[PDB]
Structures are given as structure tokens and as C-alpha cells.
Scaffold this active site. Sequence first.
Site, PDB file in Angstrom:
ATOM      1  N   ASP A 121      33.366 -22.641 -43.576  1.00  0.00           N
ATOM      2  CA  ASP A 121      33.588 -23.215 -42.485  1.00  0.00           C
ATOM      3  C   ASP A 121      32.061 -22.679 -41.137  1.00  0.00           C
ATOM      4  OD1 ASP A 121      36.414 -24.083 -40.358  1.00  0.00           O
ATOM      5  OD2 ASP A 121      34.248 -24.527 -39.900  1.00  0.00           O
ATOM      6  N   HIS A 153      35.584 -26.179 -43.582  1.00  0.00           N
ATOM      7  CA  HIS A 153      36.042 -26.834 -42.431  1.00  0.00           C
ATOM      8  C   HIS A 153      36.700 -28.084 -42.838  1.00  0.00           C
TER       9      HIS A 153
END
Length: 232
Positions: A171, A202
Site C-alpha cells: 500500500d 490500497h
Amino acid sequence: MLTEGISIQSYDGHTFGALVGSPAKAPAPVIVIAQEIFGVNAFMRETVSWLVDQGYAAVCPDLYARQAPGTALDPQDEAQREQAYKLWQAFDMEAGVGDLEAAIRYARHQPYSNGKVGLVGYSLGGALAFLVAAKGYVDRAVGYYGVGLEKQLNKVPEVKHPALFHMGGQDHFVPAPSRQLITEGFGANPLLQVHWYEEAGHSFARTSSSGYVASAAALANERTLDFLAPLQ
């Protein structure tokens, strides 16, 4: 979308709407869903129906109502995605937790509610889920790829209700050091739990996203379902 007629009011007087999803059979535990920075949009609706089919009632409060009521943005649309960033930049987290608190009270008292309330949050909502957890307003909270979690480590000792977090390994929003701070901070509290999905970034759980990873999503959503189960 928001349900017509629903109106929740905060201690300060502000009122906001919500997209509600009643359960198939009652009574049932209610899951308050904390949004990302795109308002009550497509994913929020998808999420509502996901939980009602799993056997819960669902309440997704319009948290942006203080700034722009009824806002629902498309992350794939450049213009809209930028409005999201602007609204997020003005977002007041304290009031966000307050509105969340009000929505939580709303949920416990519905005719179909069984008195149990859980809270699921994504991105922006993932940070808010942690905070409501530190306040102790829910039975148990779940956060999906929460942003700015590393900045809230001092509240770790305050969480006295179970909480589960799902964080993607790749992420961008979470730099490697942040990972170390988060893992080290959450690890000490036996009630907090953080899983890292190594091959995921993400929004790995939002299909519209390019960060979506089916296996990561499946595991994460399965863990979420088993963690919430005790509320039924």
C-alpha cells in the site's frame, strides 16, 4: 444513494442522512459502515447489500454532510477524485467520530436491531473505526486499509473492545516505516489485531480499484465475517 426519510442528529445539532439496509429477519445486529473519501457511493451500496445477505442490518451515515450533503464520488473520474481529496483535506475527524457515535446510537434502537452494533471502515473510515474503538462506542470494529493509523499509536492502550485491521503489504499510502510503527504498536494490545496482505495494496477489497486482489479480498472478508459473527 441515501435512504429517503432517514435523519440522524449529532449532539451539536447537525443532522445527516444515511443509506440504510434492513435485515432479512429480525432482530439482527447492526453494522455501521464508515466511508472512504468518496462519500456514500457505489462501493458503499455494494457493501450494504453484502452485509444484509450475510444477515446483518446496515447503516452507512453521510459523514460529508457537514461539508457537502449527498456527495457520492467516482474514484475513476479525475475531476471527482480530486473533489474527494479536497473534502478529505477539510474533513474534521473529531466531528466524524461524533457523527459516527450518533449513527451508532441510531442503530442500537431500531425495531429490528438486536442491541449489538459493529463498525466497519474503509480507508478514511478505517482510521475512524480505530478512533471509535479507542472511544469504546462499539462492540467490535473492523478497519480496511486505514490511513494515518501510525499517527494514532498513543491511543492503543485505550482500546478495550475487540478490533480487527486488514492492511495491504504494497500500500503506497503506508510507507514501510509506518508498517513497523503500526505492527509494533498494535501488537501489544491483545484486543487489537492487524493482518497484512503481502501481495495487496490500497483498496484491495474494492473491485472498481486497480488495487483489487481477489484472494486478499476473499481472505480479508472471510476474517471480517468470522470476527463479526459473535454479534449475532
